[PDB]
Ligand binder design. Structure first.
Ligand SMILES: [Mg+2]
Ligand SMILES: [Mg+2]
Ligand SMILES: [Mg+2]
Ligand SMILES: [Mg+2]
Ligand SMILES: [Mg+2]
Ligand SMILES: [Mg+2]
Ligand SMILES: [Mg+2]
Ligand SMILES: [Mg+2]
Lengths: 54, 95, 151, 48, 288
RNA sequence: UCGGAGUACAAAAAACCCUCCGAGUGAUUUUAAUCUAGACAAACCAGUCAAAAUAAUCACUUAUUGAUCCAAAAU
């Protein structure tokens, strides 16, 4: 099929993926009660230490 | 709590708070779950998991704890290697 | 002009001069894998989750720094990511600093050239994800097996 | 009758399991269990 | 300017006679008098509270107190002796050179970072210095000589790419103090002591060209450093050929606190005069 | 102190020196693992389920049990 789009239709080759919806997490609580520590990493934006003013 | 010391006039701290908790800089207080070293064989693997955890304390408990704790444990801390430094800030919190 | 008994000269007498640690041994590393002056290295900086796409591009046929066996065997296993114009496209995503994405891509590259320059690569195939492919291959093979000369 | 606690020892290394044996001894204690270090199924032997 | 000014021509003198503090500045105290706030004065009725004795804070009314049911744990364990390193982002660094607080021209160690008020060190609090992070990694355009107590790979990288030299140097509690607020140490008027060697556990960190440790063998400096470039993919500049070379080269003794001075000395800042010992035992002491 | 029924007729909860039954463990083999979404319940403490990710049954089954600290043990 790769030969087709290059040779035949003068086209670039579309590639696709399968995307399942990002998992559902409840509205974050100011004081998570009785929760595993890792609770915090659930709502983590991305993984990187971010030193705001430092 | 000792709200005024004898010799310094300052506000003392409870030590037995400190030995068993940890304060993040967000204000979240962290603790062990009680009885985790206690009667293991008698317990289901599930429970054992639930116990070996570290957990968070609700607002009431936290405020309480703060009162028994001076400034010095509320200060910001950068430890080399700190397992918990990853955790200290709040992210994406919209209230 | 101070010196103490513990100074860097007195501990390490062999190397002395202030310009000693600043030598650049270009003779030590002569190989220069992946000549970054010949790559088109593009950045997609996405800010919002903060991530910077790092993209590595060069012509497979026009790249001399890899030998012909290595140059042709890379068009084999990696043929999925290759482009209609002959370019080999490498992508990294994760780190918000684009430096670690540079290192990521240059390392996926070093990996590809390392594995393809190993004739000892046997391309081990797992049966867990491909059992469906083998069994559907054979089950379309029983019907492909009908023999009549056509056209 | 009684409830005994016995400490079961792995073949390989310091990995331990901890469990109770019956005082009448209907089935004496040796197990096929999980050892963490080498990620394996082994015979845990009854010990103290 | 402030047309408010021209409103004051109109009005009578500003004097003591007429002064109002900003509304809502004083939130007025009330006193338990009168019909409203007298009579039990918000102390409630009888019981314990009305008599002012209610029990201490951790107390649950005898049910085993919340804070006390929970088992102890290594947490704050040895918290006093765990080293701390005040972070410095590259972004903040670029900032500080940009507004010309710390100038790249002359060498940069902690002291300079301090004087630009770019960083704050409280040595008494177990702060062992400034450490480096990668935040402005891509932002960073400056050619600089930096000496820190700790740094991270990516950071070292981002300075290399621009052609500066980073050295990891250690300071003990005392010497670190002397470092940060040096003028008040001089006004203490005590000699300038020897520098400690890092403790045993720290030794391996400072002996690696990996970190460009100040106690490491310079023979590996050109090696591991060049290595840094192949990993991060850039052309390594030739520092020996540069004009600013002799500043970038500039090092300290492992025994030296400052730049240009030596253990044993004494500074008289009134006479603007340095004093060095001519006695032998002293020189053997402070030069060892 | 813990659990079943009534009191409490249909989501939940619900007292009594109220009515009636039980528990402070047996019996085995198949030794019932790590790790984590989401939940129930709940003043707190404790209690419960649990997908994906890597390699326990039967006795009405529900009850078979105690937190810190402190001691003894080794990994
Ligand atoms: Mg016993
Ligand atoms: Mg009143
Ligand atoms: Mg009264
Ligand atoms: Mg009363
Ligand atoms: Mg500080
Ligand atoms: Mg009913
Ligand atoms: Mg609820
Ligand atoms: Mg499963």
């Amino acid at each position: 099929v790769t030969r087709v789009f290059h040779q035949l239709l003068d086209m670039r080759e579309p590639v696709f993926e399968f995307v399942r919806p990002p998992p559902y997490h409840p509205k974050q609580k100011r004081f998570p009660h009785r929760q595993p520590l890792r609770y915090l990493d659930r709502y983590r934006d991305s993984h990187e230490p971010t030193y705001g003013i430092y | 709590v000792t709200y005024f010391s004898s010799r310094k006039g300052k506000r003392k701290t409870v030590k037995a708070v400190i030995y068993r908790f940890l304060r993040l800089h967000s204000g979240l207080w962290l603790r062990r779950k009680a009885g985790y070293k206690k009667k293991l064989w008698k317990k289901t693997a599930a429970r054992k998991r639930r116990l070996r955890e570290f957990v968070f304390c609700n607002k009431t408990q936290s405020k309480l704890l703060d009162k028994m704790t001076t400034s010095f444990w509320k200060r910001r801390n950068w430890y080399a290697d700190d397992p918990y430094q990853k955790y200290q800030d709040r992210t994406n919190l919209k209230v | 002009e101070f010196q103490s008994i513990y100074s860097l000269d007195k501990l390490y007498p062999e190397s002395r001069g202030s310009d000693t640690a600043w030598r650049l041994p270009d003779d030590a590393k002569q190989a220069n894998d992946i000549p970054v002056d010949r790559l088109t290295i593009s950045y997609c900086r996405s800010s919002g989750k903060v991530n910077s796409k790092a993209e590595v591009r060069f012509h497979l046929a026009s790249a001399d720094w890899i030998a012909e066996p290595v140059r042709l065997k890379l068009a084999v296993k990696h043929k999925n990511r290759i482009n209609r114009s002959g370019e080999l496209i490498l992508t990294s995503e994760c780190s918000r600093y684009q430096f670690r994405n540079l290192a990521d891509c240059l390392q996926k590259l070093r990996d590809m050239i390392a594995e393809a320059s190993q004739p000892x690569x046997x391309x081990x195939x797992x049966x867990x994800x491909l059992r469906r492919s083998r069994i559907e291959n054979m089950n379309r093979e029983r019907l492909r097996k009908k023999r009549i000369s056509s056209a | 009758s009684k409830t005994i606690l016995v400490k079961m020892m792995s073949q390989a290394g310091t990995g331990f399991s901890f469990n109770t044996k019956r005082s009448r001894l209907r089935e004496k204690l040796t197990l096929l269990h999980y050892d963490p270090v080498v990620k394996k199924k082994v015979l845990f032997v009854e010990q103290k | 300017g402030p047309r408010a000014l021209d409103l004051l021509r109109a009005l009578p003198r500003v004097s003591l006679a007429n002064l109002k503090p900003n509304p809502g500045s004083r939130k007025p105290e009330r006193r338990p008098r009168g019909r409203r706030r007298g009579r039990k004065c918000g102390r409630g009725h009888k019981g314990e509270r009305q008599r002012g004795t209610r029990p201490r804070l951790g107390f649950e009314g005898g049910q085993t107190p919340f804070y006390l049911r929970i088992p102890k744990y290594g947490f704050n364990e040895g918290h006093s002796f765990r080293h701390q390193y005040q972070p410095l982002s590259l972004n903040r660094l670029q900032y500080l050179i940009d507004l010309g607080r710390v100038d790249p021209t002359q060498p940069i160690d902690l002291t300079q970072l301090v004087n630009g008020r770019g960083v704050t060190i409280q040595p008494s609090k177990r702060d062992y210095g400034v450490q480096l992070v990668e935040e402005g990694a891509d932002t960073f355009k400056a050619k600089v000589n930096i000496e820190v107590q700790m740094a991270s790979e990516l950071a070292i990288a981002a300075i290399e790419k621009n052609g500066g030299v980073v050295t990891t140097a250690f300071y003990d509690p005392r010497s670190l103090e002397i470092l940060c607020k040096p003028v008040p140490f001089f006004l203490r008027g005590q000699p300038i002591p020897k520098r400690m060697l890092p403790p045993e556990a720290l030794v391996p960190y400072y002996t690696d060209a990996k970190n460009r440790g100040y106690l490491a063998d310079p023979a590996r400096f050109p090696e591991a450093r060049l290595e840094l470039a192949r990993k991060y993919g850039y052309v390594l500049p030739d520092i020996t050929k540069d004009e600013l070379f002799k500043m970038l080269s500039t090092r300290k003794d492992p025994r030296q606190i400052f730049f240009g001075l030596a253990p044993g000395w004494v500074v008289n800042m009134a006479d603007k005069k340095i004093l060095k010992p001519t006695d032998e035992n002293l020189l053997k002491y402070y030069s060892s």
